Design a protein around this nucleic acid. Sequence first.
DNA 1: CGTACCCATTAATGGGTACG
DNA 2: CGTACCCATTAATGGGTACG
Lengths: 66, 66
Amino acid sequence: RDVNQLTPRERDILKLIAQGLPNKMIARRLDITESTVKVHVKHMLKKMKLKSRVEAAVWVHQERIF
Amino acid sequence: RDVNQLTPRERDILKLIAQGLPNKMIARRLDITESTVKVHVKHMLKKMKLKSRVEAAVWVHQERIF
DNA sequence: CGTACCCATTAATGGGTACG
DNA sequence: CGTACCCATTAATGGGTACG
């Protein structure tokens, strides 16, 4: 699990997920469509080998990433 | 937002959600049906004024509830 | 309280193509 | 890379009734 392997946008989304935001809120916060957020989300999830956004959030708080 | 306001089983579910498990896994870990797991999740979210299981997970880690 | 359904609806997952 | 859509599916939400 290496956070540096993600792209800037992917880290943007991961940070917001770790703050408990649903895809629609992330889209409004970053001012991009929900479609795009979802693309970043699945890319991040595949690269980090995480089963869901909840794992992503928990993982972020455990390894104190960001 | 007091964790003590929850029932024992509700805290069991919260703990497992904060460990990033989906309802189906929680059901197997607790040896109860997914149906019952969903009822506890639903009760817990309303009582704790959380909007999703992700907020529940982040909250637990931020306030170190457990 | 905990159990386990019923209902409907929305959110999220995970594969694809496309194009500056 | 980042954008934004296409597809289909599962996971999750949030009301309800029921019963030991």
